[PDB]
Every structure is written in C-alpha cells, then in structure tokens.
Amino acid sequence: EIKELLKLGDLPTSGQIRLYDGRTGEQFERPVTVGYMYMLKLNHLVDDKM
Amino acid sequence: NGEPIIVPSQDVVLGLYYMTRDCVNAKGEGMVLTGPKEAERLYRSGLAS
Amino acid sequence: KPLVGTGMERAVAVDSGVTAVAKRGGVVQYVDASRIVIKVNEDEMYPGEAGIDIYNLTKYTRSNQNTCINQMPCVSLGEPVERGDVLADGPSTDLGELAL
Amino acid sequence: EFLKPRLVDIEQVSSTHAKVTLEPLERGFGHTLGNALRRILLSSMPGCAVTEVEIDGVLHEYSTKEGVQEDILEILLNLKGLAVRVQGKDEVILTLNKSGIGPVTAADITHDGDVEIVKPQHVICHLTDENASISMRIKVQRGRGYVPASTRIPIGRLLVDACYSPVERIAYNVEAARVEQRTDLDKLVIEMETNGTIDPEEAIRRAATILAEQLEAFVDL
Amino acid sequence: SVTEFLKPRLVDIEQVSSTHAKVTLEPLERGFGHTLGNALRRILLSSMPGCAVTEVEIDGVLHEYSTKEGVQEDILEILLNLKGLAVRVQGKDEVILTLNKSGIGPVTAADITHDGDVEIVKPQHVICHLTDENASISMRIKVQRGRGYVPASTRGRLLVDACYSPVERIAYNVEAARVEQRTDLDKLVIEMETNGTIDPEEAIRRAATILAEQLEAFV
C-alpha cells in the first residue's frame, strides 16, 4: 500500500532519492532515505540544565 | 587490560570500512598510479571510484 | 497535525478537557479570540429559555509545568456546528486532532 | 582561452519563480559556478522584512484585542511573512487602518507611494464585528540574513524577528549546449523561487559581484 | 550598509619546501570559506593550463606488456617515472624530446636532449636504472599542453596519463575564527603541493584570476 501511494504521486517507490552535498555540490552515492517524520520537542531544555 | 580505549566507535569505522574496500568492477579500474596523492586527485576530480 | 497518525488523535483530544466542545448543535452567532456565541437550533431548544451557548476561552494562563495553555477559536462566523464539535483548539491541538 | 559565460535568457515562468540561463561554459565550470552562485544567492541577499509593529490598544503580544478573531501573536506571525519592496530608503513606516467585518489583507495598508506590496491577497487577520477597528504602524527596513528580535534588543513596541531574505529555493543544472558548431560545452540553468521582491537577473549580478569581490583577496587585476 | 561584507587578508603563508605551502585567510563571512575553498579546489584540480608528457615511443617494445634486457624494472615503472617528469615549455604546444643512453648506472632527466626551449625542473629525477653496459635505451617522448588531467583510457605507441595541472595536492579546511564581537566567522586554510613548475602562491593567484575573468559578464 505504501508503494502504491508513492506511485500515486510521482515519487520513487524505493523511498530513497538522490541528494547533493550542500557545500561541495557533489552527488552522494548510495541513494538515501528522505521523508517526513513527526518530531517532538521534549521538556529537557539546555538552558534549564546549565 | 592492555587494550586501547581510543578506538574509533561507529561512524569513523563505517567510513573507513566503506573507504578501504573493493568492488570487482568500478570506474577507473586497472590503471597504474604514482602514489597516494594522484589517487586522491583522481578520486576528487571524479575520474575514479 | 501528524501526517501519519493512527486515528486515535480525535478521541484523545476530545475526551480531555482542553478543547471547547459544542454542547448543543447550532449556528455560530459570534466569534472572537476570547468568546464564542452559538445560536442553538429550534429542534434542540427547551420550551422556554431561548438562550445561546457562550463559551469563554482560556487565554494565556499557566500550567503546572510552567508551560502555556491557550485556546484558539477554529470556527468562523456564521457556520453550522453539531453536537460534539470542537469549537476552540486547546494546546497541542489542530482542528480537534491532537498535535504534539 | 576559456569561453566566458553570458546571460543568454531570463524565462520569467511566473511571478514567484524564474529561470535564468548562462551560456557557454567550459568543462567543469558549470558545477563550480552553479554551486558558488547557489550558496551566495541562498545565504546573503538584501531584503525588506518587517521589524516592528505598534497596534493601538495593545501592550504585549500575549494579549487579545476585542473584535478580532486572531491573537496578537498570530497577527505578528502573519506580518512576519509579508513581502514588500522599499524602493529608495533604508527604513520606512507603513500604516494600516481598517474597520468593519471582513478579512484584513495587505491591500489595506496605506499606500505610501515610495513602496510596493507584492502580494495584496496576504491576509493578516479577520475582523468580526461591525463596530470594531484595527489600526497599526508597521516598521519595514532593509537588511541581510536573519537577526532575531532578541539579538537586536516604550511599552507598546512589539519586535518581530526579521528575515531579510527574498529567496526561498535555488535549484540549478548543467546541460549540453549544441552551440558554435562545436560540442563539449555546457549551459547552466538556474531555477529560483522568491517572495517576488528581487528581480532574478539583478540577484545573479549581485551574487557574481560578491563572489568577485571576495576573490579579490588573493589575486591582483 | 547591506553590501558591506568582510574582506580578508592573507594572515600568513607558512612556507615549507618550495613546492609546498599553506595559505590562511581570516576572517571570512559565515559560510564563505566553503564556497571559496571548493571553487579554488575544483579550478586547481580540473582546469589549469600546464605542460605534460602525453606519449612515449620505446624503439623496441611495441606491445604494452613486454620486457627489456638490462633494466630491472619493466616498462610500467618507466611510464610512472615519466609521469613524474615536470616540464616547462614556451608558446610551442608539442615537441619531440629524445633520450638515448647506454652504460651502467641510472638514467635521470639530466641527459635528455636539452636542445629547444623546454627545460626540466628536476634533472636528478631518476627515470630508470640499467644493470648492464651493452644494453642501450632509446626513447621519444611527446610533451603537450592541456587543461587538467586526461587519462589514457579516455583516448608502437604507448599512452601515458597526461597530468597537466601543476598541483599534486590541494586541500582546504574551514575553521572557526572570531572578530571581536561576532561568533561565527570562517577561517580558510589552503594547504597544497606542486611539481615545482610554479610555487603554490602563483597557482592560487592564477586560479583566482581564472575565476574572476570568468565572472566578467555579470559584475
């Protein structure tokens, strides 16, 4: 089902795309897994621990 | 014990294992080089894997 | 909101006392950052007591962990609402869904 | 002798984003120029972000005004992403006045002839009472980069973080150019998104000027 | 004052043996170290006018895998030692050098036919040892001019990987330096070697010149 939903859009079914280095403009080899993940910010702030 | 405690952990070893490896047919196989420096120039310029 | 959820977000956000849930279905008479006035429907109204549902939202007050709890209206003026409909979004909520 | 590049074409494929072409380029200069210009374009260009706001009856941004559906904080968050083109000044002050039910777009800012709002559909807030008014002063100024309100710190003056950067996205690619009856040459196509406040060719010119002026450190013309 | 960037000045040049050097630039704008370093690295590695030794013609051996009597090392090391032959030439593009020798002892670059405008910057660069006296060596090496690195694969002739660019290693490293009241400014540290044809500062200056003249249609 995930592959079918990827193919509905124009994304690659492998889930891994081609990226380029941000500061040398050079293609990384080895297609890397990019996607959207739900990130949380826990209540352990460094300005309360220092 | 005697063993070191400054062994590289996980990303360093992955990098050195990917870097020091061999593929049975990669770009720019089977040419002769004059030293490490020419190997590095070949790799950076893109002319070899 | 999450792009990938489990469908359990709506229940968790509605069953806690952070949102402002429409007691009786009606038509949104008036909206504001602090107040919502809902004109109740004839089918759902008592014999007397024409009445209207007034929800006072909870602006920037303090929680036990010194965080901020704040209710934002999510309805707009002149809109239908049924029973069990989220009118204001509490903290970590997005149109009724839990959003952490 | 290297063949020098030229600004062959500027396809303004929309108001938002455009497509510049550079041609002709030698072996290996396409990627070099493309990446250097991408970094300069994405990092350091001048913009005209909003800096300060005064709402009339407001003290702090954690407050609520009567008859507006928005918290003052989210009014600020909507102003923080407002596009504008200050023409001939470093700093200007715009003014918004509105009364009556309805949205409050950017088209409701007093005209202030020596500026230009690029997107007049940008909605700031929603007035929800006929006898309810909003009146604010919005301070715009030219700058570079990102400077939060804290790093640059009366009792009604609401600072907003300033994001003086008109470019959202820079992509580029090099592709072969059958030009001069000669193969083995490149053409660099640069697609660039914007908030609409910097013409693409001037952005390219400014980036090239920056790169050359930085290269002056260890050369002598 | 939004166009007032930070202009560096070469804080030092830690000179080492004449072909080796380490330039350092401080203080650069946030993120300009990497763009400047990468642009210079690419220009210095992949595009530099220089002179190399493209072809060689041993009189006897036709095929790439055979042997001479009298030399302990086979022809592969001969080609490698030729790739180490740094050369300078004037406006002429290609010339035919020749090295005829016979007798015991090494064959360096100090006995190639010195005639012509060409010169060799390492006359003591040993090309090949002879372990006999009756064995003779006769070569005919074609130098040429080019703009980077051109392997033999991309092309009794013997092909040699022509390395035109004078730099043998270029490496930058962006550090963190601070002007009095700003946290994040860069510090570029170029370190590089060459084959002695041009000292490193000349190479860096020429690369920057090439890029600058490339950016004349915009500024």
Curated annotation (Swiss-Prot), chain A:
Domain of life: Bacteria
Residue ranges of coiled coil: none
Post-translational modification: Acetylated on several lysine residues in the presence of glucose.
Application notes: Co-administration of salinamide and rifampicin or salinamide and myxopyronin suppresses the emergence of resistance to both antibiotics.
Residues that bear N6-acetyllysine: 7
Purpose of the protein: DNA-dependent RNA polymerase (RNAP) catalyzes the transcription of DNA into RNA using the four ribonucleoside triphosphates as substrates. Resistance to the antibiotics salinamide A, salinamide B, rifampicin, streptolydigin, CBR703, myxopyronin, and lipiarmycin can result from mutations in this protein.
Subunit structure of this chain's protein: The RNAP catalytic core consists of 2 alpha, 1 beta, 1 beta' and 1 omega subunit. When a sigma factor is associated with the core the holoenzyme is formed, which can initiate transcription. The rRNA transcription and antitermination complex (rrnTAC) consists of RNAP, NusA, NusB, NusE (rpsJ), NusG, SubB, ribosomal protein S4, DNA and precursor rRNA; S4 is more flexible than other subunits. In pull-down experiments interacts with CedA.
UniProt family annotation: Belongs to the RNA polymerase beta chain family.
Name of this chain's protein: DNA-directed RNA polymerase subunit beta
Upper taxonomic lineage: Bacteria, Pseudomonadati, Pseudomonadota, Gammaproteobacteria, Enterobacterales
From Swiss-Prot, chain B:
Taxonomy, superkingdom: Bacteria
Outcome of swapping residue 10 to P: Resistant to antibiotics salinamide A and B
PTM remark: Acetylated on several lysine residues in the presence of glucose.
Cystine residue pairs: none
Applications reported: Co-administration of salinamide and rifampicin or salinamide and myxopyronin suppresses the emergence of resistance to both antibiotics.
Assembly information from the UniProt record: The RNAP catalytic core consists of 2 alpha, 1 beta, 1 beta' and 1 omega subunit. When a sigma factor is associated with the core the holoenzyme is formed, which can initiate transcription. The rRNA transcription and antitermination complex (rrnTAC) consists of RNAP, NusA, NusB, NusE (rpsJ), NusG, SubB, ribosomal protein S4, DNA and precursor rRNA; S4 is more flexible than other subunits.
Record's function text: DNA-dependent RNA polymerase (RNAP) catalyzes the transcription of DNA into RNA using the four ribonucleoside triphosphates as substrates.
Family to which the UniProt record says this protein belongs: Belongs to the RNA polymerase beta' chain family.
This protein's name: DNA-directed RNA polymerase subunit beta'
Organism: Escherichia coli (strain K12)
Residues included from the entire protein: 495 to 543 of 1407
Swiss-Prot record, chain C:
Reported uses of this protein in biotechnology and industry: Co-administration of salinamide and rifampicin or salinamide and myxopyronin suppresses the emergence of resistance to both antibiotics.
Listed name of the protein: DNA-directed RNA polymerase subunit beta
Disulfide linkage: none
Described function: DNA-dependent RNA polymerase (RNAP) catalyzes the transcription of DNA into RNA using the four ribonucleoside triphosphates as substrates.
Subunit field text: The RNAP catalytic core consists of 2 alpha, 1 beta, 1 beta' and 1 omega subunit. When a sigma factor is associated with the core the holoenzyme is formed, which can initiate transcription. The rRNA transcription and antitermination complex (rrnTAC) consists of RNAP, NusA, NusB, NusE (rpsJ), NusG, SubB, ribosomal protein S4, DNA and precursor rRNA; S4 is more flexible than other subunits. In pull-down experiments interacts with CedA.
PTM remark: Acetylated on several lysine residues in the presence of glucose.
Species assigned in the record: Escherichia coli (strain K12)
Family affiliation: Belongs to the RNA polymerase beta chain family.
From Swiss-Prot, chain D:
Function statement: DNA-dependent RNA polymerase (RNAP) catalyzes the transcription of DNA into RNA using the four ribonucleoside triphosphates as substrates. This subunit plays an important role in subunit assembly since its dimerization is the first step in the sequential assembly of subunits to form the holoenzyme.
Annotated organism of origin: Escherichia coli (strain K12)
Transmembrane segments: none
Region (Alpha N-terminal domain (alpha-NTD)): 1-221
Listed EC numbers: 2.7.7.6
GO BP: bacterial-type flagellum assembly; bacterial-type flagellum-dependent cell motility; cell motility; cellular response to cell envelope stress; DNA-templated transcription initiation; intracellular iron ion homeostasis; nitrate assimilation; regulation of DNA-templated transcription elongation
Catalytic activity: RNA(n) + a ribonucleoside 5'-triphosphate = RNA(n+1) + diphosphate
Keywords: Acetylation, ADP-ribosylation, DNA-directed RNA polymerase, Nucleotidyltransferase, Transcription, Transferase
A single Gene Ontology CC term: transcription elongation factor complex
PTM remark: (Microbial infection) ADP-ribosylated on both alpha subunits by the phage T4 protein ModA. ADP-ribosylated on only one of the alpha subunits by the phage T4 protein Alt.
GO molecular function annotation: DNA binding; DNA-directed RNA polymerase activity; protein dimerization activity
Recorded superkingdom: Bacteria
Family affiliation: Belongs to the RNA polymerase alpha chain family.
Protein name from the UniProt record: DNA-directed RNA polymerase subunit alpha
